[PDB]
Design a protein around this ligand. Structure first.
Ligand SMILES: O=C(NC[C@H](O)CN1CCc2ccccc2C1)c1cc(NC2COC2)ncn1
Ligand SMILES: Nc1ncnc2c1ncn2[C@@H]1O[C@H](CSCC[C@H](N)C(=O)O)[C@@H](O)[C@H]1O
Lengths: 625, 309
């Protein structure tokens, strides 16, 4: 199903009209609050003293309806950025008036047009209105894909449409929104209602709207082609955009009169529903990540904190991770023990950080698949989980598993290990301190011993998301640095964003590590070719890992293990959004830092401009040892 | 009269004298429960705007943005609904009946004019489009998306059936000629100017016209010379309408949002001025019978008759 409404600039009987559109199958209505042609004078007499009423009464609908069904529209004559002072001053007063009436009715949204370059004064007034009174109203900026000037039929004899292309010129519509939203200091209550023309522009200018808080898409009736049997439809490239927009879950807005008069009006709507019906159905991954889209989370710290029961339970339901782990041990067995040794040689396996013990069961399944014998140690620091392990142990596993209720860095092993099996990986691989944990544990691995995983690698990519930048911005808390939220990573199912370059590797760790002076601190410089005008809001983190040989796990979008929802991506925000021009290189610098107590990250952007070094000394974010 | 409504909406939008003497009125409701429009016929010009002393009347679905006389019985209407509709008069002239009603514009149809022949008309709208209509056949022959903003005013040339002016908030004034492959031509008095709002051809010379900007400055233009011959700060507000008198050497009537009326020389000097209106001045119409008589409507529901020296 689609959430969509009818746009009208003419309403005779509000009672009939709202019924008529609801009958047609529309969820809401976009209408004016005052008559569009009813220009009002606020300054000079006699026009100033026009007797009321100034508009129709609020009594005509129930509060229920005003709150749910009606989206107000600023009278088209209101022009706060006029060249004429008198119009400027009147528009100011008029705008405040109309916005106040909108808020008085308690409308969920109110439409305002971005149809020219200069909207400085329009912004100020709205901003002033936003900081006056206490209301929860949203504001939709009507901004078109292509400027009306760049759509005109080339029919002016002495002013032809310049046939040459301009990369930046054709993106001018985004720059209108950008200037406007920046002036309003990224208010969460200012969104985009994107108008779609008949002719879609080049793919690049469509793409800049990625990461933008698009709440609505506006479709003029005219843009709809008619088919073999007199029905409104859309092109293939228009369908593409619609499908892109459906994933972003925007509301749709139909504007203009029916130009396919022979059939009913709900025909435009029917086709939209039909397009929503036909959408490629959600995969195994998307049926799990449903509610988590663009939702910021704190990173887990399973060292200094014990994980809750349900946390384990949910992540234990992964259809792939344990299947991949089972195979990675299965291959390591067949390699370490020859066929003639299948009864003389019992291998010693050590599950470091066993959790509730699914990797113990996966170790047991790997044995009775490779027909080899194994001794098991289930080491776990979380005493609450150890309760589950010792219960699994007594009821099922028996003497084969030797549960150890301690930290691996601390545990004194009775015997050395053939294979150590561990899943201590975060979204950025090393961020849950898997390097440090296995280091204090590799002393009780045999000299020829195998560590699973063998290695892992973190990846980074620059993102543009004005949406996610505002989410972080909203994470300011009392009793701490007012910018602390920018100096910490977030686990998030990234959704409304734009990947500006290809993910490149960042940090890599190998296990075991026989380097004489073992060191886990890092410093890495990355360079990202960017080929669009954009605004950088941070860096997206992913990881890959090698469990054994070719058996691998990845959350990197290119090599993502299919159906594996165990990890969402990480986000490293940056304090100030950086403007990036087409054909420029983003240069980022990451440092992994640690002392004896805690490990943390520090980052900075060096090109095209410099940012501040983020989270220095781990002042805002650390992972404790 | 039968079908003629008992009451008329407060906001009077247009006033046009028929060549025989009658007065046509279009009025909209721009406030209150119902936002609508009505059409009125007054064979007694002095009786206006009394709903009880009218010859004919009818309600329209939505408000009246603009209208024009088509011939002697036809009424052409630019509806808020996005529709252009023709209203046919009775043979008795006591009933106003709808001829056609076509929803072809997407936003409010804001301006309409009839071409010299009287079988074709041109409409401008907020949707930015301008459309050429076949009145006899009730269809659009041509659709022109030439401007970049809402079309404020369209005025057909007096005699050439293929020529008309149009101005819009994109600061463009376009001289049209459907005979050319590129019909529109950008006629600019100056490169930067306050937005044009009103247009009127000179009734004698098909080569000169006048235009009022949003600033209260009426300017006289020559098409061939393409320079502002003359201008004057006539109004203190947006110039909303311009009408020439039927005189041999004609006067210019001037409408604005400063609620005042102005009647001007050929050199645009002030002759007459009237603040008789307490709200916006919406239209002006010269009496065919008495040339020195001029009728003006406003949003103050006042129908005023002026005697011009
Ligand atoms: O990426 C996330 N967390 C980062 C952690 O490193 C994930 N690991 C994954 C493996 C694991 C196994 C046992 C106990 C805990 C964990 C935690 C994340 C994903 C998500 N996924 C939704 C649950 O279904 C999709 N929800 C909230 N956080
Ligand atoms: N230094 C350390 N010593 C012992 N256990 C640790 C540790 N660091 C993390 N762990 C444990 O390792 C587990 C990581 S989560 C993995 C749980 C389980 N193997 C599964 O896949 O479902 C947590 O239960 C945590 O308590």
């Amino acid at each position: 199903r689609v959430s969509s409404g009818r746009d009208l600039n003419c309403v005779p009987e509000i009672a009939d009209t709202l019924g008529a559109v609801a009958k047609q199958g529309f969820d809401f209505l976009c209408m004016p609050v005052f008559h569009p042609r009813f220009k009002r004078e606020f300054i000079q007499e006699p026009a100033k003293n026009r007797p009321g009423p100034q508009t129709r009464s609020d009594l005509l609908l129930s509060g229920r309806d005003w709150n749910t069904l009606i989206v107000g529209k600023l009278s088209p004559w209101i022009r706060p950025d006029s060249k004429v002072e008198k119009i400027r001053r009147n528009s100011e007063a008029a705008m405040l008036q109309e916005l106040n009436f909108g808020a008085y009715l308690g409308l969920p949204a109110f439409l305002l047009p971005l149809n020219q370059e200069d909207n400085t004064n329009l912004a100020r007034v709205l901003t002033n209105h936003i900081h006056t009174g206490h209301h929860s109203s949203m504001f939709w900026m009507r901004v078109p894909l292509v400027a009306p000037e760049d759509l005109r039929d080339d029919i002016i004899e002495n002013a032809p449409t310049t046939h040459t292309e301009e990369y930046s010129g054709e993106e001018k519509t985004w720059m209108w929104w950008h200037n406007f939203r920046t002036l309003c200091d990224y208010s969460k209550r200012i969104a985009v209602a994107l108008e779609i023309g008949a002719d879609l522009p080049s793919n690049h200018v469509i793409d800049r709207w990625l990461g933008e808080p698009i709440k609505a898409a506006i479709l003029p009736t005219s843009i709809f082609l008619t088919n073999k049997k007199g029905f409104p439809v859309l092109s293939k490239m228009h369908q593409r955009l619609i499908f892109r927009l459906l994933k972003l879950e925007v509301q749709f807005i139909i504007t203009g009169t029916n130009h396919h008069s022979e059939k009913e009006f709900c025909s435009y709507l029917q086709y939209l529903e039909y397009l929503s019906q036909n959408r490629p159905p959600p995969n195994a991954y998307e049926l799990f990540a449903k509610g988590y889209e663009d939702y910021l989370q704190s990173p887990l710290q399973p060292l200094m904190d014990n994980l809750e029961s349900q946390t384990y339970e949910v992540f234990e339901k992964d259809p792939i991770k344990y299947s991949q782990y089972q195979q990675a041990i299965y291959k390591c067995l067949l390699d370490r023990v020859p066929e003639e040794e299948k009864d003389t040689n019992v291998q010693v396996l050590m599950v470091l950080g066993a959790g509730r013990g699914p990797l113990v069961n996966a170790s047991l399944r790997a044995a009775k698949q490779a027909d080899r014998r194994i001794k098991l140690y289930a080491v776990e620091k979380n005493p609450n989980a150890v309760v589950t392990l010792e219960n699994w142990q007594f009821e099922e596993w028996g003497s084969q598993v030797t549960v150890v209720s301690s930290d691996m860095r601390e545990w004194v092993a009775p015997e050395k290990a053939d294979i150590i099996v561990s899943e201590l990986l975060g979204s950025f691989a090393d961020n849950e301190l898997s390097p440090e944990c296995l280091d204090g544990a590799q002393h009780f691995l045999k000299d020829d011993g195998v560590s699973i995983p063998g290695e892992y690698t973190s990846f980074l990519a620059p993102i543009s998301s004005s949406k996610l930048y505002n989410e972080v911005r909203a994470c300011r808390e009392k009793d701490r640095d007012p910018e602390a939220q920018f100096e910490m990573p977030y686990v998030v199912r990234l959704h409304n964003f734009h990947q500006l370059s290809a993910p490149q590797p960042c940090f890599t760790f190998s296990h075991p590590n026989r380097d004489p002076m073992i060191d886990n601190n890092r410093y890495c410089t990355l360079e990202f070719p960017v080929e669009v005008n954009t605004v950088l809001h941070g860096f997206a983190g992913y990881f890959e890992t090698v469990l054994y040989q070719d058996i691998t796990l990845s959350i990197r979008p290119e090599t993502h293990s299919p159906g594996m929802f165990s990890w969402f991506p990480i986000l490293f925000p940056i304090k100030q959004p950086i403007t990036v021009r087409e054909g420029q290189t983003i240069c980022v610098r990451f440092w992994r830092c640690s002392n004896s107590k805690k490990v943390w990250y520090e980052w900075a952007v060096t090109a095209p401009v410099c940012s501040a070094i983020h989270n220095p000394t781990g002042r805002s974010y650390t992972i404790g040892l | 009269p039968p079908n003629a409504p008992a009451c008329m909406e407060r906001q009077l939008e247009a006033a046009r004298y028929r060549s025989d003497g009658a007065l046509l009125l279009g009025a909209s409701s721009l406030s209150g429960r119902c936002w609508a429009g009505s059409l009125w016929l007054f064979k007694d010009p002095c009786a206006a705007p009394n709903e009880g002393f009218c010859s004919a009347g009818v309600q329209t679905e939505a408000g009246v943005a603009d209208l024009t006389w088509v011939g002697e019985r036809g009424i052409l209407v630019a509806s808020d609904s996005g529709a252009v509709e023709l209203w046919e008069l009775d043979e008795n002239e006591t009933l106003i009946v709808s001829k056609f009603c076509k929803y072809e514009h997407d936003d409010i149809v804001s301006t309409v004019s009839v071409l010299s022949s009287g079988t074709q008309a041109v409409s401008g709208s907020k949707d930015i489009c301008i459309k050429v209509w076949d009145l006899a056949q009730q269809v659009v022959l041509s659709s022109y998306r030439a401007h970049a903003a809402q079309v404020t005013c369209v005025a057909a040339s007096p005699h050439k059936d293929s020529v008309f002016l149009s101005c819009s908030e994109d600061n463009r004034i376009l001289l049209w000629d459907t005979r050319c492959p590129k019909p529109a031509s950008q006629i600019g008095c100056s490169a930067p100017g306050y937005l044009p709002t009103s247009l009127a051809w000179h009734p004698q010379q098909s080569e000169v016209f006048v235009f009022g900007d949003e600033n209260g400055t009426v300017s006289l233009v020559d098409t061939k010379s393409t320079s502002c011959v003359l201008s004057s700060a006539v109004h203190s507000q947006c110039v909303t309408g311009l009408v020439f008198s039927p005189h041999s050497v004609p006067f210019l009537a001037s409408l604005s949002e400063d609620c005042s009326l102005a009647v001007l020389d050929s050199s645009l000097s002030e002759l007459f001025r009237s603040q008789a209106h307490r709200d916006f001045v919406r239209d002006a119409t010269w009496s065919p019978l008495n040339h020195s008589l001029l009728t003006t409507v406003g949003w103050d529901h006042q129908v005023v008759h002026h005697v011009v020296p």
